[PDB]
Amino acid sequence: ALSISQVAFEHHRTALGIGETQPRVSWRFDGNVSDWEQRAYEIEVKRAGHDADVFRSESSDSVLVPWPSSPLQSGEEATVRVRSFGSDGQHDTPWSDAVTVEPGLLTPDDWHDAVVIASDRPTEVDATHRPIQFRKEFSVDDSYVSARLYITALGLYEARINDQRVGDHVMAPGWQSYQYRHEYNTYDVTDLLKQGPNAIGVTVGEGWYSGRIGYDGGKRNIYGDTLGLLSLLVVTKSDGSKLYIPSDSSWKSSTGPIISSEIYDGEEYDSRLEQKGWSQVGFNSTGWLGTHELSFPKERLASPDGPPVRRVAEHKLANVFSSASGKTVLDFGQNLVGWLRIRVKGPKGQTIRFVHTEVMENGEVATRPLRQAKATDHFTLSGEGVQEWEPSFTYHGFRYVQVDGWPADTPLDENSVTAIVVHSDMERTGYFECSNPLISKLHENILWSMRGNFFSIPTDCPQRDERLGWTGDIHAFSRTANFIYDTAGFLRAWLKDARSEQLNHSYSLPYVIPNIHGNGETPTSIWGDAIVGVPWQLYESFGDKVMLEEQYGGAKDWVDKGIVRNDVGLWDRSTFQWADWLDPKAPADDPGDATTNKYLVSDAYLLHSTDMLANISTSLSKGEEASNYTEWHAKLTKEFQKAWITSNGTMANETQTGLALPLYFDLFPSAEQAQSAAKRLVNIIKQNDYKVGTGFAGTHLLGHTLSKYGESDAFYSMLRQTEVPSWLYQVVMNGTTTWERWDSMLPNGSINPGQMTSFNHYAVGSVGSWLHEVIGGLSPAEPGWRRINIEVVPGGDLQQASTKFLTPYGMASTKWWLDGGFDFHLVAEVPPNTRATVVLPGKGGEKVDVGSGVHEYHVRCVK
Numbered sequence: 001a002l003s004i005s006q007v008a009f010e011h012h013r014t015a016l017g018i019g020e021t022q023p024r025v026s027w028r029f030d031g032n033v034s035d036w037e038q039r040a041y042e043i044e045v046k047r048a049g050h051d052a053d054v055f056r057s058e059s060s061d062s063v064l065v066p067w068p069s070s071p072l073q074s075g076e077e078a079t080v081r082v083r084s085f086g087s088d089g090q091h092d093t094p095w096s097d098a099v100t101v102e103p104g105l106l107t108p109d110d111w112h113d114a115v116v117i118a119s120d121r122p123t124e125v126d127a128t129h130r131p132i133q134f135r136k137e138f139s140v141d142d143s144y145v146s147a148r149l150y151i152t153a154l155g156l157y158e159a160r161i162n163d164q165r166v167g168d169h170v171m172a173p174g175w176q177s178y179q180y181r182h183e184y185n186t187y188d189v190t191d192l193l194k195q196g197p198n199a200i201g202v203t204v205g206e207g208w209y210s211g212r213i214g215y216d217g218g219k220r221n222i223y224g225d226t227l228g229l230l231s232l233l234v235v236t237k238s239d240g241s242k243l244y245i246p247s248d249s250s251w252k253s254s255t256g257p258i259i260s261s262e263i264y265d266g267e268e269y270d271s272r273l274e275q276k277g278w279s280q281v282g283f284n285s286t287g288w289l290g291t292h293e294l295s296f297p298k299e300r301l302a303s304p305d306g307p308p309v310r311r312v313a314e315h316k317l318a319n320v321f322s323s324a325s326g327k328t329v330l331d332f333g334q335n336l337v338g339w340l341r342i343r344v345k346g347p348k349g350q351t352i353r354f355v356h357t358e359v360m361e362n363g364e365v366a367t368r369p370l371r372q373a374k375a376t377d378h379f380t381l382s383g384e385g386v387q388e389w390e391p392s393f394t395y396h397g398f399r400y401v402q403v404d405g406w407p408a409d410t411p412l413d414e415n416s417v418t419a420i421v422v423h424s425d426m427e428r429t430g431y432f433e434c435s436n437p438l439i440s441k442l443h444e445n446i447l448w449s450m451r452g453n454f455f456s457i458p459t460d461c462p463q464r465d466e467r468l469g470w471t472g473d474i475h476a477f478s479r480t481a482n483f484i485y486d487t488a489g490f491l492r493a494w495l496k497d498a499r500s501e502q503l504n505h506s507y508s509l510p511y512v513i514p515n516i517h518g519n520g521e522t523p524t525s526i527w528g529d530a531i532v533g534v535p536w537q538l539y540e541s542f543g544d545k546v547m548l549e550e551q552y553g554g555a556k557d558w559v560d561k562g563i564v565r566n567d568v569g570l571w572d573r574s575t576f577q578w579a580d581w582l583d584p585k586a587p588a589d590d591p592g593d594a595t596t597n598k599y600l601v602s603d604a605y606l607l608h609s610t611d612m613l614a615n616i617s618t619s620l621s622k623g624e625e626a627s628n629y630t631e632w633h634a635k636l637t638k639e640f641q642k643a644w645i646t647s648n649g650t651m652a653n654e655t656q657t658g659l660a661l662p663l664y665f666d667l668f669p670s671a672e673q674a675q676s677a678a679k680r681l682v683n684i685i686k687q688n689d690y691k692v693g694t695g696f697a698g699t700h701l702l703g704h705t706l707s708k709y710g711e712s713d714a715f716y717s718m719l720r721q722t723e724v725p726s727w728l729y730q731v732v733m734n735g736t737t738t739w740e741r742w743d744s745m746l747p748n749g750s751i752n753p754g755q756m757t758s759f760n761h762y763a764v765g766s767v768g769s770w771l772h773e774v775i776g777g778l779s780p781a782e783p784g785w786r787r788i789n790i791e792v793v794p795g796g797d798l799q800q801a802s803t804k805f806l807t808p809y810g811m812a813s814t815k816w817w818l819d820g821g822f823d824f825h826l827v828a829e830v831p832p833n834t835r836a837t838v839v840l841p842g843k844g845g846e847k848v849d850v851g852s853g854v855h856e857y858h859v860r861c862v863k
């Protein structure tokens, strides 16, 4: 009936090497108990050599409660259990399963004598960096009880101890704004050591730190021009004393089988150059070079806030086929993000080439829209039996692979090639399916676009010469994203970088974070507004007041000093603006040439940010600020009206976006003028045969706007359209991801002629929140989901839908179906320690307050 399913620290999935000495604690519940609320909890904290302490709190809080013990030291592990007591004095949990928590290296001094090292091999000039192998042998000549490896790279790393891979993180440490914040990783390497002689080997690649990043050719050596390694191995002996094995000038270095490995262009691997045993003792290191120190400020080093990038899944080969010209092509059945794993035998010195693409065009793999990203891997065989390979420091976005040079010796099939799905390994929380198979597939496609683009940072796309942390895209998508996966730690980290970048950009937000573009970009609405909107949404989703406070300064400085204003406080009308980017009527070559005025759009979003900032101020008990922004919002609402709304309530541009924004942002001077505008919006949509008419500014809000005004049936009609432009067009064209453009592929199969065309962008997938909140009915009634609204709006000829969301408290869900107006049936699951408001469908539909449990509703003759 009731248990604790998960005990977690901050927003970490697991807590090894964390940055917090007083980490907050949360527990999720499992069980079908009715109307249950917590009155108290106990946290057991065990430190080696000490009796456990038990700390009791009279509290209903089960999310982000205080660390109850003395602060943890660097490298100090505690073991924790929790139990929770019910308010009725009748249902209490057993003790949770035990979990551990341990801070990392919290100060520069905690790194002991570890320094960043580089090879004595000269770095390449005006060229990609060949990966460097670094190695060290050491002795553990005392009995030991535990060991840790603390490691990062100026680049990306893969570490081995005695030829065993250290951990399961890939593309490590990921992409931070490295000049401000540089993540390092912590691993428990106790079981990889042996008594006596040991070896550590680490391969370092260029990654984002020094690789070629950016479009229009990009730039390399952005953060530095030399591959570097920082490493500290700490072994705790039986007597509690420690051995320290630092990175320093005693290490040796060499090139190895990786010839090149680049984010965009791919990896060239020559297996003939493998040096077997290099990560083990007794190795012949003849010909290896020395190493030297690189100056580096350890003040930037940080623990991750969120989960690492991992090889999350395999995806099997679906088909092998011949192209129009007889080339061999793999089809994985899904446009995925990661790389291949091969198992193959063939002639020594024969090279296999793998060219990865999202789509086919004109009977061949389509590389054209990748621009200056080759997405091509080369593997040269050794003929020394069956070889297994995956690339190390690249990734690709693809469904198809053209394969040249595959050896006759090995059949090309599901036993010799598979796809590896790679992304930030967040906990899955949100699920949706319904009776309409196309809309169910749309949700799957949104899920896959999220997976492809939550890759250390929230990327615009994963395939071409871009993959940057575009601010506007995540602003539009995060309401959707934060339901599908637990994004809290991931976005916490990103938003720290956003703030650092902003503080060196005159309080404006760079277009992409991390910022590769310098200080020349002028402030923009929607994109710049991410520094308000993403925090606001994060708080709605996870309820973390500490994180809202850390994000406050970015939001406030943006409104106060970042936005460039005209004389009455609206946007300066000489500024560049993205605004309603990729309006389906914009020309393919000029995606910003929208049907809605860029300043009408911008000013709407200025009002929205001001409103969000007022509300955040109120949440944080900043009264002066809250009143100030409330005042500014009212004055600027008048200026918005003067600029963009005629006296009779007509918008300057009567377009889907031009109407949807002032409707959602409540910018009309009267409820009557707003209601009239809502009916005109529905009429414009109907006259457009229900085809979508919004770009990035309008799309994420369009369904919510229509539902806000009781026009869900109109949106259902849009959602069911299968002709371009629409969501399901992309589905019926065999899309398995959401596309950048409504028409990234044209109906005869040709790719959009625009130079900027991707088949894997989450922005259009912002419709997912409407599936979750309106078809599925689920939304937070209090930030963090301790109070839930359950307001299913059936329509669109759906017969049933099932939606699930793993709240911070436990599972919430709806399952509804129709039969027998109609008879409506709903099963609603409400987790322990929460309450919900169930709003049953139809005119005068009953509203019902409920507590935890499984609730069944049967509504006969719904009109």
Ligand SMILES: *[C@@H]1O[C@H](CO)[C@@H](O[C@@H]2O[C@H](CO)[C@@H](O[C@@H]3O[C@H](CO[C@H]4O[C@H](CO[C@H]5O[C@H](CO)[C@@H](O)[C@H](O)[C@@H]5O)[C@@H](O)[C@H](O[C@H]5O[C@H](CO)[C@@H](O)[C@H](O)[C@@H]5O)[C@@H]4O)[C@@H](O)[C@H](O[C@H]4O[C@H](CO)[C@@H](O)[C@H](O)[C@@H]4O)[C@@H]3O)[C@H](O)[C@H]2NC(C)=O)[C@H](O)[C@H]1NC(C)=O
Pocket (backbone or CB within 6 Å): 611, 612, 615, 637, 666, 667, 668, 669, 670, 671, 674
């Ligand atoms: C930031 O926080 C603010 C404040 O919480 C929030 O704005 C509110 O959003 C809620 C919905 O979530 C709105 O509540 C709805 O209000 C409907 C009635 O609206 C009319 O009356 C409102 C109240 O007027 C009194 O109180 C205000 C405040 O003290 C005072 O100024 C007035 O003088 C008066 O004393 C009034 O605020 C509102 O005015 C807005 O809209 C008009 C019309 O377009 C616009 O001209 C204004 O400029 C202004 O933006 C309007 O006059 C009510 O019918 C509705 O009830 C339905 O829905 C609820 C739940 O949604 C159901 O429970 C119910 O059964 C009904 O179906 C609902 O209560 C509220 O009006 C907003 N308040 C304000 C001041 O804007 C923002 O959304 C937050 N921002 C973000 C980004 O989240």
Ligand SMILES: *[C@@H]1O[C@H](CO)[C@@H](O[C@@H]2O[C@H](CO)[C@@H](O[C@@H]3O[C@H](CO[C@H]4O[C@H](CO[C@H]5O[C@H](CO)[C@@H](O)[C@H](O)[C@@H]5O)[C@@H](O)[C@H](O[C@H]5O[C@H](CO)[C@@H](O)[C@H](O)[C@@H]5O)[C@@H]4O)[C@@H](O)[C@H](O)[C@@H]3O)[C@H](O)[C@H]2NC(C)=O)[C@H](O)[C@H]1NC(C)=O
Pocket (backbone or CB within 6 Å): 584, 585, 586, 587, 588, 589, 743, 746, 747, 748, 749, 750, 753
């Ligand atoms: C596969 O299908 C392709 C798509 O159907 C097809 O290419 C099409 O071929 C037809 C017949 O020749 C052309 O039809 C002619 O179009 C012109 C009007 O063209 C102008 O308007 C269209 C539509 O614009 C609106 O819709 C788009 C989104 O659909 C918005 O981006 C846009 O802003 C408008 O709202 C537009 O696509 C055209 O733009 C292309 O062509 C111009 C030059 O004309 C370029 O400058 C531009 O970069 C772009 O390539 C153009 O602005 C009309 O007057 C004639 O009466 C006739 O209707 C289509 O234009 C053409 N489409 C494209 C994209 O080329 C391929 O031939 C076919 N391939 C195969 C192998 O079968």
Ligand SMILES: *[C@@H]1O[C@H](CO)[C@@H](O[C@@H]2O[C@H](CO)[C@@H](O[C@@H]3O[C@H](CO[C@H]4O[C@H](CO)[C@@H](O)[C@H](O)[C@@H]4O)[C@@H](O)[C@H](O[C@H]4O[C@H](CO)[C@@H](O)[C@H](O)[C@@H]4O)[C@@H]3O)[C@H](O)[C@H]2NC(C)=O)[C@H](O)[C@H]1NC(C)=O
Pocket (backbone or CB within 6 Å): 559, 560, 561, 565, 624, 625, 628, 629, 632
């Ligand atoms: C209520 O909301 C408003 C609007 O969001 C906030 O107004 C901003 O307030 C800050 C100060 O808190 C202002 O920033 C200061 O601006 C001065 C220059 O102002 C002129 O030029 C700008 C830019 O072109 C115009 O926007 C402005 O109207 C003026 O014509 C600077 O001199 C100040 O710098 C000095 O103080 C700062 C500390 O803030 C130091 O760091 C500097 O070293 C220097 O000594 C400062 O930058 C900002 O201009 C205001 N914006 C607008 C749009 O009016 C309120 O702060 C807010 N109030 C509350 C309580 O929330």
Ligand SMILES: *[C@@H]1O[C@H](CO)[C@@H](O[C@@H]2O[C@H](CO)[C@@H](O[C@@H]3O[C@H](CO)[C@@H](O)[C@H](O[C@H]4O[C@H](CO)[C@@H](O)[C@H](O)[C@@H]4O)[C@@H]3O)[C@H](O)[C@H]2NC(C)=O)[C@H](O)[C@H]1NC(C)=O
Pocket (backbone or CB within 6 Å): 179, 219, 220, 221, 222, 223, 504, 518, 519
């Ligand atoms: C805070 O912001 C300021 C302003 O942007 C910033 O200072 C700037 O830093 C950049 C480096 O990011 C400097 O840009 C260099 O400029 C020189 C010529 O002056 C160029 O040669 C460089 O380009 C070459 O080298 C690059 C790196 O290897 C390659 O990627 C590139 O392809 C070229 O080969 C580079 O553009 C810039 O000069 C300063 N500007 C000013 C006005 O100081 C500062 O770094 C920011 N602070 C932090 C902590 O980030």
Ligand SMILES: *[C@@H]1O[C@H](CO)[C@@H](O[C@@H]2O[C@H](CO)[C@@H](O)[C@H](O)[C@H]2NC(C)=O)[C@H](O)[C@H]1NC(C)=O
Pocket (backbone or CB within 6 Å): 594, 595, 596, 597, 598, 652, 653
């Ligand atoms: C959207 O509305 C704006 C504002 O009314 C239109 O822009 C005006 O167009 C007229 C006639 O061409 C010009 O005289 C004004 O100078 C324009 N004002 C501004 C603020 O630009 C605009 O044409 C409409 N359509 C679009 C796509 O913006």
Ligand SMILES: *[C@@H]1O[C@H](CO)[C@@H](O)[C@H](O)[C@H]1NC(C)=O
Pocket (backbone or CB within 6 Å): 646, 647, 648, 649, 650
């Ligand atoms: C009145 O509404 C019409 C649309 O019916 C619109 O074109 C016009 O701009 C409006 N005039 C005024 C003064 O509000």
Ligand SMILES: *[C@@H]1O[C@H](CO)[C@@H](O)[C@H](O)[C@H]1NC(C)=O
Pocket (backbone or CB within 6 Å): 733, 734, 748, 749
């Ligand atoms: C979609 O797949 C079907 C086969 O399942 C094929 O007939 C059709 O041509 C495909 N459409 C596109 C746009 O590739």
Ligand SMILES: OC[C@H]1O[C@@H](O)[C@H](O)[C@@H](O)[C@@H]1O
Pocket (backbone or CB within 6 Å): 460, 461, 466, 470, 471, 472, 473, 578, 581, 756, 761
């Ligand atoms: O070219 C600019 C665009 O690049 C895209 O990939 C991003 O999705 C947009 O945010 C951005 O405006």
Ligand SMILES: [Ca+2]
Pocket (backbone or CB within 6 Å): 003, 004, 005
């Ligand atoms: Ca259990």
Ligand SMILES: [Ca+2]
Pocket (backbone or CB within 6 Å): 030, 031, 811
């Ligand atoms: Ca359960």
Ligand SMILES: [Ca+2]
Pocket (backbone or CB within 6 Å): 034, 035, 036, 037, 087, 088
């Ligand atoms: Ca109770």
Ligand SMILES: [Ca+2]
Pocket (backbone or CB within 6 Å): 051, 052, 053
């Ligand atoms: Ca004690």
Ligand SMILES: [Ca+2]
Pocket (backbone or CB within 6 Å): 061, 062, 063, 064, 065
């Ligand atoms: Ca709490």
Ligand SMILES: [Ca+2]
Pocket (backbone or CB within 6 Å): 141, 142
């Ligand atoms: Ca010994």
Ligand SMILES: [Ca+2]
Pocket (backbone or CB within 6 Å): 188
């Ligand atoms: Ca362990």
Ligand SMILES: [Ca+2]
Pocket (backbone or CB within 6 Å): 259, 268
């Ligand atoms: Ca080569």
